[PDB]
Amino acid sequence: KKWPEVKIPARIITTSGNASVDGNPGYRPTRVDSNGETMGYEMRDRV
Amino acid sequence: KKWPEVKIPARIITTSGNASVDGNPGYRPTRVDSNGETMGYEMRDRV
Amino acid sequence: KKWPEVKIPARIITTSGNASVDGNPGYRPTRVDSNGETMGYEMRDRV
Amino acid sequence: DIAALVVDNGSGMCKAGFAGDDAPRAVFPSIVGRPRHQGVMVGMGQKDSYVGDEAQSKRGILTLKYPIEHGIVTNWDDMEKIWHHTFYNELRVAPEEHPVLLTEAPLNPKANREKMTQIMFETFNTPAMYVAIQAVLSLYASGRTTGIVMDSGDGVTHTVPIYEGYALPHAILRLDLAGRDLTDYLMKILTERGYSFTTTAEREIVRDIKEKLCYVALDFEQEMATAASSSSLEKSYELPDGQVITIGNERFRCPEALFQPSFLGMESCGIHETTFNSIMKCDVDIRKDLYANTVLSGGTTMYPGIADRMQKEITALAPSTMKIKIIAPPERKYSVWIGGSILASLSTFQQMWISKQEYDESGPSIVHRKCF
Amino acid sequence: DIAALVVDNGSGMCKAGFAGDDAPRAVFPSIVGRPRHQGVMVGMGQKDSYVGDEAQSKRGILTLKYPIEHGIVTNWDDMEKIWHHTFYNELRVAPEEHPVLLTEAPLNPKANREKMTQIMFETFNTPAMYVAIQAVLSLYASGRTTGIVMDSGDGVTHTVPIYEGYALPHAILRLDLAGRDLTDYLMKILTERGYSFTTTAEREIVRDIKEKLCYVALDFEQEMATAASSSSLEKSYELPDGQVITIGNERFRCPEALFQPSFLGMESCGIHETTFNSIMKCDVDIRKDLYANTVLSGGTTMYPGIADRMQKEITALAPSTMKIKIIAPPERKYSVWIGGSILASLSTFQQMWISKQEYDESGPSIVHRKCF
Amino acid sequence: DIAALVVDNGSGMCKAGFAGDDAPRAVFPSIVGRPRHQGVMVGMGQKDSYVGDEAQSKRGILTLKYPIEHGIVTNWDDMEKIWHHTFYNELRVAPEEHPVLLTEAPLNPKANREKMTQIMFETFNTPAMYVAIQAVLSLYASGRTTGIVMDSGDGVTHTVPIYEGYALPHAILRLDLAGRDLTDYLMKILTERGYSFTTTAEREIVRDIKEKLCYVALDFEQEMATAASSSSLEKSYELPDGQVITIGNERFRCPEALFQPSFLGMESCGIHETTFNSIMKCDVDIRKDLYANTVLSGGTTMYPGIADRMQKEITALAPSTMKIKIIAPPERKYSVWIGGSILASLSTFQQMWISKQEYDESGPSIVHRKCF
Ligand SMILES: Nc1ncnc2c1ncn2[C@@H]1O[C@H](COP(=O)(O)OP(=O)(O)NP(=O)(O)O)[C@@H](O)[C@H]1O
Ligand SMILES: Nc1ncnc2c1ncn2[C@@H]1O[C@H](COP(=O)(O)OP(=O)(O)NP(=O)(O)O)[C@@H](O)[C@H]1O
Ligand SMILES: Nc1ncnc2c1ncn2[C@@H]1O[C@H](COP(=O)(O)OP(=O)(O)NP(=O)(O)O)[C@@H](O)[C@H]1O
Ligand SMILES: [Mg+2]
Ligand SMILES: [Mg+2]
Ligand SMILES: [Mg+2]
């Protein structure tokens, strides 16, 4: 059976921790925003 | 179909490189100028 | 007082960074080697 | 089902094999690379993407991407390429007939497990799947039911205290400081000598330099003073193009960021204090056994002299009557996979698998109540 | 001592003067040139070497070489000529009685700074000397104590975040992409129209073309589409010999390599993403003030529209709530020198000089524990 | 369509044939000549212009014009005569039913390629056409997908690095120094012995002298010292009128301008240093394979001993641990044409042609997004 989809949340860049925008030069850290407010970042593959 | 024409730009004589006026004794290095500005040279066949 | 000398290390040519052999046409990039190992390059003034 | 598979998908390395084996059959970096240059030759079979060892070999023309950062998948499209390579190209097996035991670091986002489950069941159609904690697996490889496991890989350092068959989740600690941060720090400190490694392939070059030449000093200030007389501690490393670099005090300043995270600008305490805090967060009666069974595991803990330093610092923190023992096997780099293969071949573990029937009737959220 | 000297001797331009002045007294390129042709006329007062503006004046018969490449001195023999010209011909002062404040890019080789100190103390006999970071001085000129300085000179681009006087060295980023690379790129792309500038004097000609006519596009694809109607964006430039060249879309392809380094074949992020990454590597509580006080400095940041483009790109990266403000003072070129003159004249700074007594005591290595 | 034509329209030589052939069917100089004297014999079949070998035969009463200079067409009215001769006289084919693959040097003006496309589609009505880089084709003839090609024709020298199918356009270097400059230099230096070749026919005579007797010294200073005791290195050459000249140290001072461009008054690096710079501008991990696969091609690289000199010079520049290998095929004069014939007959290449239907809907500018 198929279940709808697992939506991975947008990454929050803290001082130091789970996520960083500089980690992967091959990924572009695109801003994710809904309702006009920024929810975080996700690593698209362009740069 | 016929496309209008490829216009080759006037040659710019640097110290050494793509173009020179002394290369071909059979070509006269005529000056090309539009308005008052001398855009470069082109090799007519007279000398 | 006079201290002996500051020895400048040989430049390591990476993909893109601090040093390159093509940067200065006036400098010859002479190879620096000690023992059988190539330590890098330095810019002598001949070319 | 023929046999179970074990895949230790860490931040930087992928270790795949079969349950019951004593070593991973396939080991390759968790890298997806794509060409960053023009391409003029026709034919030649120029693929638009390379995975694992092939990407490493061709890295001179590729931009290398790690789909996992700090043990968390940042790009699932490339993670699916990693898994497809792992199954069809490395193991040469059909996932539809093999259970898959995956690994994850503790305190990960819950959606990371859910998408692992969803991909394993919907795109690979695995008959069964499980997601075990990396440090818990490492205790299996040590043959112990009691002790604290200090596990450091490419992206995550975590400590899990375990008494007799029982873990203590409140005492589990995690640092987002591991081999990748040390590689970047070595990249930044090699510029003091003029080396300017910047590209992703040069990141792998610096990682090789780190793995071959970095080591943990027993006394940092004394070793700095020794390296001040700079003739003995310096080592030469030949780059892939023939130029050789010289590395001196950076050799031990390179792993020192594990014990002094302030070198990276981090506020967190070192790995030695992380383990000590993890032990002190447990019950008083069990601390004595955790001190004598401090298991060291992970590829980052492979620096020479790291066990001696860990013993030196923990003896200074723990009470003097405790007998501190740092247990560092020769195979720390594979302890997680060995424990996963042991667990996946236990008879008592066969009912702990997430069955395909359970996924059908419960969805990806089954992983939260079934695994851990 | 009478007064302090400030020498912002960057990769491309030497900028010298006195502390307390609001503008450098002498500005000339960091160029040493030697004749490359046969001297036939006896007498004439010929010289085996020419320095600075004199080399530019007679660059036709001269081969021009930059002692500094990427903020690092590659030939100290010509650096001694440059500094001797600076002291005795441009400033017309004796270094024996003036403290000297020098400038250096961050993440430079440590031996480059050491030989700066050694030459200043043993060859020019300066009573005192100091080495300051270029981007740090630009914050002094702006009058701020909080903000991130994006300095783009001729060899180096670097960002330094500072919050209430405290710099964050772990967040400092460096890009080896600056005006020299853009000049070489413009030399490359001008060949599409048949212009074949090859020599070092023609490199200066192309640098003049770049400084006069190159500009930053607010939307690169829109500007390309507009330039497809090639009569509006085209500009004429007259060579020193009178021939007139025409430049078109190259005018904005010329600075675009700053934001798309892949134009140069490089893998690094653009200058906009470098600043954003530098801000994100800082603490969460201080990023809001770094966004509102992003300061531009250096000669390369003088392109028209670079402030608006940097503003546009950053607000698309930073969270929508932040008030992205780019500060681009008209004195962007001399921002480093003005900050150095301010710092050197501060009463609280007079005990931070490296004294000649300290140099006798400690040697060239004194500069590492005294300076940034 | 019957078959594809390949025309290697270099500065000095025209080499034409059919795809799939192992050698060009027609080879003749790219020369258009016109009479410079009074015709007095009525009839006689006199004509106002001669092309190719007929101009060479009649060059005494003719003024010889090269329509191409430095790989760039300077007079299209004569390049069209060259192409008309190539099609209707040398190959004896109708271009309206054969796709035509032309060659061009890199970093050429974009209008030169556009007029090639326009002339091929609007005057010769070719069903399809394509423009390929000369050095790229030379790698095809070598049976390689990895290596750097140093191509030296009559007008241009260029190096193109390729690694496993992908070229690095940022590392491509171009020198406007080739066989024509060497011929003019030999004309200049032969005046030291009183030989005063001045006309275009005498330029061809000096070109023949250069091709028969000029050679590359392994050690220029030692060869000069050997030629100082002039007995053995001198050779005799007979002019077409019966007078014989003697050439001495000029034989190896003749190609030395390739390695020391300062002999011509040029500032650029030698052909050995340009190749080394092109290799060093590539990625670190691919330089090792570029060193072992340095390919020489073009008519100018046909000097005896040029491969040994190139190996000697690059070995002194490259790091000592690299194995420098200079591949100089015996037929490297036609290496570009052989690669073009291989490419034009490849099955996968047949969908990369610029079709007549594509030119009709897009015009001459189609060539920029199709060929490179
Ligand atoms: N001999 C060594 N010396 C030093 N560091 C090493 C050595 N071997 C491996 N490493 C480091 O450890 C990494 C691999 O360790 P590994 O345990 O495979 O990490 P992982 O499981 O991929 N990541 P994680 O999710 O953090 O466990 C390498 O990429 C290096 O950073
Ligand atoms: N108007 C301008 N437009 C564009 N670029 C310019 C302009 N003026 C100067 N530049 C560039 O900036 C350079 C000089 O800037 P400057 O701030 O003096 O650099 P530097 O301090 O010498 N170098 P570094 O040490 O790497 O910071 C010139 O050589 C050009 O490359
Ligand atoms: N045996 C030889 N020895 C030395 N030089 C030679 C020899 N044969 C030919 N040449 C030179 O090489 C030229 C022809 O080389 P070729 O590869 O046909 O150049 P091209 O392709 O016409 N020019 P380009 O546009 O630079 O590729 C001659 O005109 C001479 O200058
Ligand atoms: Mg691990
Ligand atoms: Mg500067
Ligand atoms: Mg050719």
Side-chain angles (χ1 to χ4, degrees):
Chain A
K1 293 186 178 182
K2 203 84 73 180
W3 288 89
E5 182 153 295
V6 180
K7 293 296 168 14
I8 21 83
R11 311 198 304 152
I12 295 299
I13 317 301
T14 36
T15 314
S16 59
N18 284 357
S20 62
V21 295
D22 193 52
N24 266 300
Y27 293 140
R28 190 170 64 107
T30 56
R31 190 182 76 212
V32 177
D33 36 19
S34 60
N35 323 310
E37 72 215 338
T38 295
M39 303 314 297
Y41 294 84
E42 67 185 357
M43 301 305 268
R44 305 292 192 77
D45 185 11
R46 246 285 65 75
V47 301
Chain B
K1 293 186 179 185
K2 201 85 71 175
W3 287 83
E5 182 154 309
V6 178
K7 299 300 184 68
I8 317 295
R11 277 140 69 79
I12 289 289
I13 315 300
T14 52
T15 88
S16 56
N18 289 20
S20 58
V21 298
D22 196 43
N24 265 299
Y27 292 140
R28 189 168 61 104
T30 67
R31 193 183 73 221
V32 173
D33 36 13
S34 63
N35 306 299
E37 300 196 309
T38 160
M39 311 305 317
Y41 295 85
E42 70 182 5
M43 306 305 285
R44 302 294 191 76
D45 186 9
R46 245 289 69 75
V47 303
Chain C
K1 292 186 181 179
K2 199 154 187 170
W3 291 86
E5 178 149 32
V6 179
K7 298 299 183 69
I8 301 301
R11 295 139 41 81
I12 289 289
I13 317 301
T14 54
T15 314
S16 52
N18 285 15
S20 57
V21 297
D22 197 40
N24 269 298
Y27 293 149
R28 185 167 56 206
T30 58
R31 190 183 75 211
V32 172
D33 43 358
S34 67
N35 308 295
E37 305 198 297
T38 290
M39 291 335 278
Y41 296 84
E42 49 166 29
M43 301 315 258
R44 301 289 189 78
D45 186 9
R46 193 29 52 204
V47 303
Chain D
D1 304 350
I2 299 169
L5 306 175
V6 183
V7 196
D8 181 33
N9 297 106
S11 313
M13 271 285 168
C14 187
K15 311 160 203 277
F18 299 81
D21 285 3
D22 57 1
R25 199 172 294 192
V27 176
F28 62 94
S30 192
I31 286 175
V32 183
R34 59 167 160 70
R36 71 186 197 85
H37 288 129
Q38 203 154 50
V40 295
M41 309 270 92
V42 317
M44 161 75 228
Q46 284 164 39
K47 299 189 295 187
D48 62 347
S49 178
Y50 308 92
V51 186
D53 283 333
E54 181 143 350
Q56 192 77 351
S57 180
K58 302 172 80 93
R59 69 184 186 226
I61 46 157
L62 310 185
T63 285
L64 300 187
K65 304 170 286 162
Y66 281 89
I68 311 189
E69 213 213 335
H70 294 305
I72 301 161
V73 184
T74 69
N75 189 292
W76 286 93
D77 303 87
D78 287 344
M79 181 65 148
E80 284 183 43
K81 297 171 192 164
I82 298 298
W83 278 329
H84 188 278
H85 189 76
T86 296
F87 292 129
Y88 297 104
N89 291 71
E90 292 290 344
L91 290 180
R92 274 161 260 281
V93 298
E96 310 89 41
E97 56 191 5
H98 299 277
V100 183
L101 185 134
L102 301 176
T103 76
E104 206 196 40
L107 305 173
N108 247 30
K110 291 207 307 181
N112 199 77
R113 284 151 101 81
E114 289 186 50
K115 214 169 201 297
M116 271 186 228
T117 307
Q118 171 142 110
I119 282 169
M120 286 297 152
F121 278 114
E122 293 186 0
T123 80
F124 298 125
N125 308 132
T126 58
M129 181 215 78
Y130 193 81
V131 188
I133 301 300
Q134 282 173 339
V136 178
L137 297 186
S138 175
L139 198 73
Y140 278 94
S142 278
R144 283 169 168 68
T145 59
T146 290
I148 175 169
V149 184
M150 217 296 293
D151 194 289
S152 303
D154 203 51
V156 194
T157 290
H158 51 268
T159 71
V160 175
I162 287 147
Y163 199 55
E164 271 147 22
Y166 291 101
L168 290 92
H170 58 84
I172 297 180
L173 296 185
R174 174 183 166 136
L175 281 183
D176 302 294
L177 160 50
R180 181 53 138 74
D181 310 84
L182 305 178
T183 302
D184 298 337
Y185 183 58
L186 183 63
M187 286 206 320
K188 93 173 287 282
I189 70 173
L190 281 178
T191 73
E192 298 173 20
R193 298 192 179 241
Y195 315 140
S196 187
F197 304 114
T198 63
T199 59
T200 58
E202 285 160 339
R203 193 189 319 287
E204 312 286 292
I205 294 171
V206 179
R207 173 171 70 58
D208 194 46
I209 294 161
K210 179 186 81 77
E211 290 177 11
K212 278 174 166 58
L213 295 183
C214 289
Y215 72 96
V216 173
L218 183 62
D219 185 9
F220 180 70
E221 297 297 333
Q222 185 56 247
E223 280 271 329
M224 291 275 318
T226 302
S229 307
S230 316
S231 66
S232 58
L233 266 56
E234 306 195 354
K235 285 281 181 277
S236 302
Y237 174 93
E238 179 177 346
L239 301 183
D241 71 344
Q243 301 174 94
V244 335
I245 73 162
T246 299
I247 185 185
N249 69 72
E250 300 90 357
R251 291 178 65 214
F252 59 89
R253 193 153 51 108
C254 159
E256 189 62 24
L258 290 170
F259 300 97
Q260 299 186 65
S262 61
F263 284 16
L264 314 179
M266 297 182 58
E267 187 172 324
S268 58
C269 63
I271 62 168
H272 63 297
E273 274 185 296
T274 300
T275 308
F276 171 69
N277 291 345
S278 186
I279 296 168
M280 281 285 148
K281 285 160 84 44
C282 301
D283 303 49
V284 177
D285 312 81
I286 84 158
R287 294 177 192 162
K288 177 177 178 285
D289 303 283
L290 300 183
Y291 283 134
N293 295 276
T294 296
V295 178
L296 217 68
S297 148
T300 271
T301 71
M302 291 296 296
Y303 292 112
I306 191 173
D308 299 301
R309 171 68 88 91
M310 281 283 290
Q311 173 144 37
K312 172 190 173 295
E313 310 274 39
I314 297 177
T315 50
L317 289 162
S320 62
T321 60
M322 291 307 137
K323 284 142 191 53
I324 311 309
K325 188 187 300 289
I326 306 301
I327 304 180
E331 74 265 350
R332 314 198 274 286
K333 193 137 62 163
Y334 306 117
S335 285
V336 175
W337 189 95
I338 295 160
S341 83
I342 289 163
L343 181 60
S345 64
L346 292 179
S347 61
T348 88
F349 181 71
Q350 303 304 110
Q351 83 261 336
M352 302 190 183
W353 291 104
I354 299 154
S355 294
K356 188 170 61 173
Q357 179 183 24
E358 295 180 310
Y359 183 83
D360 276 27
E361 81 188 348
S362 317
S365 64
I366 189 57
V367 72
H368 303 313
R369 94 181 61 111
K370 192 74 176 193
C371 292
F372 191 89
Chain E
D1 303 352
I2 301 167
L5 313 181
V6 182
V7 185
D8 179 37
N9 202 333
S11 315
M13 281 265 158
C14 188
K15 277 160 201 183
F18 295 84
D21 286 5
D22 50 282
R25 198 166 295 199
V27 180
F28 64 93
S30 184
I31 270 172
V32 180
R34 63 171 156 67
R36 71 185 200 84
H37 288 129
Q38 181 191 346
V40 295
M41 309 268 300
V42 317
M44 162 65 227
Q46 287 157 22
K47 299 170 59 170
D48 65 334
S49 180
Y50 307 89
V51 185
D53 281 338
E54 173 95 348
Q56 276 269 63
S57 278
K58 60 201 70 202
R59 69 187 185 224
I61 43 157
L62 257 60
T63 283
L64 306 185
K65 41 205 160 54
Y66 283 84
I68 312 193
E69 199 215 344
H70 293 305
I72 303 163
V73 189
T74 72
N75 194 286
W76 282 101
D77 295 351
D78 287 340
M79 210 37 177
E80 284 181 35
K81 297 172 194 165
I82 293 281
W83 280 338
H84 182 279
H85 185 78
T86 298
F87 294 135
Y88 294 106
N89 297 336
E90 293 293 341
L91 293 182
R92 271 172 298 268
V93 297
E96 320 143 27
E97 57 191 5
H98 299 288
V100 183
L101 192 147
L102 302 179
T103 62
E104 202 190 27
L107 305 173
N108 244 27
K110 293 204 308 181
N112 184 85
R113 184 182 285 200
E114 284 187 47
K115 208 175 223 289
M116 271 196 238
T117 308
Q118 201 204 29
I119 284 172
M120 289 276 117
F121 278 114
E122 296 183 353
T123 306
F124 298 116
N125 305 126
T126 57
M129 183 224 76
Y130 191 80
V131 186
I133 300 302
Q134 314 212 64
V136 174
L137 299 186
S138 306
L139 202 73
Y140 277 98
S142 78
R144 288 167 165 76
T145 49
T146 300
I148 176 169
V149 177
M150 211 285 288
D151 186 284
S152 211
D154 190 60
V156 202
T157 289
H158 52 256
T159 73
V160 179
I162 291 140
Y163 182 80
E164 266 148 28
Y166 297 98
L168 292 91
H170 61 86
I172 295 178
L173 297 184
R174 175 181 167 134
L175 230 54
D176 299 290
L177 198 181
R180 182 52 140 77
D181 310 271
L182 305 179
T183 302
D184 296 339
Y185 183 56
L186 182 64
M187 294 207 340
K188 181 180 179 283
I189 71 178
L190 281 176
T191 70
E192 294 168 9
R193 297 187 184 244
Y195 314 141
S196 153
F197 306 115
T198 60
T199 54
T200 55
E202 287 166 334
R203 173 156 328 113
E204 303 304 315
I205 296 172
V206 179
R207 187 180 56 74
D208 191 48
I209 295 162
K210 181 190 78 85
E211 289 176 9
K212 278 175 165 56
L213 295 182
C214 288
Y215 72 98
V216 175
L218 186 63
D219 183 349
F220 178 72
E221 299 297 335
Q222 201 43 79
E223 281 285 350
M224 282 302 267
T226 307
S229 307
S230 315
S231 67
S232 56
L233 268 45
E234 295 204 351
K235 285 282 184 277
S236 297
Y237 175 92
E238 185 175 336
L239 299 189
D241 72 343
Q243 292 177 98
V244 178
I245 78 166
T246 302
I247 190 185
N249 58 63
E250 301 89 358
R251 293 177 67 214
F252 55 88
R253 287 165 65 205
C254 183
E256 187 64 21
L258 290 165
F259 300 92
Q260 297 193 259
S262 60
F263 285 12
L264 311 177
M266 309 181 20
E267 192 173 28
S268 59
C269 291
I271 63 169
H272 62 296
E273 273 176 31
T274 301
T275 308
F276 171 71
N277 291 4
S278 185
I279 295 166
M280 281 285 138
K281 293 169 55 55
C282 298
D283 302 45
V284 174
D285 315 86
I286 82 153
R287 292 176 196 158
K288 163 165 178 257
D289 303 278
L290 299 181
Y291 283 134
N293 306 253
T294 294
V295 182
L296 303 191
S297 60
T300 281
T301 68
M302 291 285 328
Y303 289 114
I306 194 157
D308 307 282
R309 181 63 177 292
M310 282 272 306
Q311 174 144 28
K312 182 209 180 193
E313 296 280 32
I314 293 177
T315 166
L317 286 159
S320 52
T321 305
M322 303 306 177
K323 304 272 181 313
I324 307 313
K325 179 183 296 286
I326 308 299
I327 293 94
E331 68 264 17
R332 256 166 289 172
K333 289 180 186 173
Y334 313 124
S335 211
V336 178
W337 188 95
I338 294 160
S341 84
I342 289 164
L343 179 60
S345 65
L346 290 179
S347 63
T348 40
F349 180 74
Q350 303 294 110
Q351 83 264 350
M352 272 154 79
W353 298 99
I354 300 158
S355 296
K356 190 168 63 179
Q357 182 215 60
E358 293 180 300
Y359 183 78
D360 293 358
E361 271 176 350
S362 316
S365 61
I366 190 56
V367 76
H368 301 312
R369 54 161 161 290
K370 205 83 174 183
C371 301
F372 188 99
Chain F
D1 303 353
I2 300 173
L5 311 182
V6 183
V7 199
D8 182 37
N9 295 110
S11 311
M13 283 303 247
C14 188
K15 312 173 179 181
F18 301 87
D21 284 356
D22 44 343
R25 198 166 297 196
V27 177
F28 65 93
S30 193
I31 273 186
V32 179
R34 62 166 158 70
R36 71 186 201 83
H37 291 130
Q38 290 190 12
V40 300
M41 300 272 110
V42 314
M44 162 56 218
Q46 297 184 329
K47 44 193 271 203
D48 58 1
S49 189
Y50 309 87
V51 184
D53 284 335
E54 212 195 0
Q56 203 84 330
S57 289
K58 284 175 165 58
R59 71 185 186 221
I61 48 156
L62 251 71
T63 286
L64 304 185
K65 304 171 287 160
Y66 279 88
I68 307 186
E69 197 216 346
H70 292 305
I72 303 158
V73 181
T74 74
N75 186 267
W76 289 91
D77 302 70
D78 285 341
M79 181 65 148
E80 202 174 346
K81 296 182 181 79
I82 296 299
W83 280 325
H84 186 281
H85 187 72
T86 298
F87 294 138
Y88 297 106
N89 298 330
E90 288 294 296
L91 294 184
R92 264 171 301 280
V93 297
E96 32 260 29
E97 56 198 3
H98 302 279
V100 183
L101 184 131
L102 310 165
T103 54
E104 204 192 23
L107 301 165
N108 244 28
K110 292 206 311 175
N112 189 82
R113 187 175 290 196
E114 289 186 46
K115 214 167 198 288
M116 285 189 194
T117 307
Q118 184 196 268
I119 284 172
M120 286 296 150
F121 279 120
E122 298 194 350
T123 75
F124 300 117
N125 287 315
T126 61
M129 73 93 66
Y130 190 85
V131 188
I133 302 301
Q134 313 212 59
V136 173
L137 300 185
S138 290
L139 197 69
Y140 259 113
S142 273
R144 279 167 172 77
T145 57
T146 300
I148 176 172
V149 184
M150 211 285 298
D151 200 290
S152 211
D154 198 52
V156 201
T157 289
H158 49 274
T159 72
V160 177
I162 291 141
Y163 181 83
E164 261 156 20
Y166 304 84
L168 292 91
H170 57 85
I172 296 180
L173 298 189
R174 174 181 165 135
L175 264 172
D176 302 288
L177 159 53
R180 181 54 138 75
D181 311 86
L182 302 179
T183 303
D184 300 344
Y185 182 55
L186 182 63
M187 299 207 329
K188 166 174 151 65
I189 71 178
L190 281 173
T191 71
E192 296 171 17
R193 299 196 183 234
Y195 315 140
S196 192
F197 306 113
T198 60
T199 55
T200 59
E202 289 163 332
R203 192 181 328 279
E204 300 302 317
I205 295 170
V206 179
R207 188 183 53 71
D208 193 49
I209 294 159
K210 178 186 84 76
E211 285 177 12
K212 278 173 167 57
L213 297 185
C214 287
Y215 73 97
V216 171
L218 185 62
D219 183 10
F220 177 70
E221 302 297 335
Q222 193 54 60
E223 280 285 319
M224 285 294 287
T226 303
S229 308
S230 317
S231 53
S232 56
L233 267 56
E234 308 212 15
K235 286 281 182 276
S236 302
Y237 174 93
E238 181 182 315
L239 302 185
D241 70 347
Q243 296 177 92
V244 311
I245 77 171
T246 304
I247 194 193
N249 67 71
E250 298 93 349
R251 292 176 67 215
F252 57 88
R253 192 153 52 106
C254 180
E256 190 63 22
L258 289 172
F259 301 96
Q260 299 187 65
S262 58
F263 283 17
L264 313 178
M266 310 186 48
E267 204 177 300
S268 55
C269 291
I271 62 167
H272 63 297
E273 269 180 31
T274 46
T275 307
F276 169 71
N277 292 6
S278 185
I279 296 167
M280 277 274 138
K281 292 170 45 65
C282 297
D283 298 49
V284 172
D285 318 81
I286 82 161
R287 294 179 192 157
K288 164 163 190 33
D289 303 85
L290 299 180
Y291 284 133
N293 294 282
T294 294
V295 180
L296 303 190
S297 51
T300 281
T301 71
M302 283 294 307
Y303 290 112
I306 194 169
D308 301 320
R309 169 67 92 92
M310 282 286 285
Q311 174 144 28
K312 176 180 178 286
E313 300 281 24
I314 297 172
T315 279
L317 286 163
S320 48
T321 61
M322 296 293 107
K323 293 141 191 42
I324 311 310
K325 185 177 294 289
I326 309 301
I327 292 104
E331 83 300 323
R332 70 185 169 276
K333 194 163 201 293
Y334 305 120
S335 199
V336 181
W337 190 94
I338 294 159
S341 91
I342 291 162
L343 180 62
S345 65
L346 279 173
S347 95
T348 58
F349 181 75
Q350 313 294 90
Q351 43 94 20
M352 301 193 184
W353 291 104
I354 301 163
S355 314
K356 176 85 79 66
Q357 191 262 299
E358 290 170 272
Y359 178 82
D360 283 348
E361 75 183 349
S362 174
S365 65
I366 188 57
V367 75
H368 300 311
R369 54 161 160 300
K370 201 85 183 186
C371 290
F372 215 69

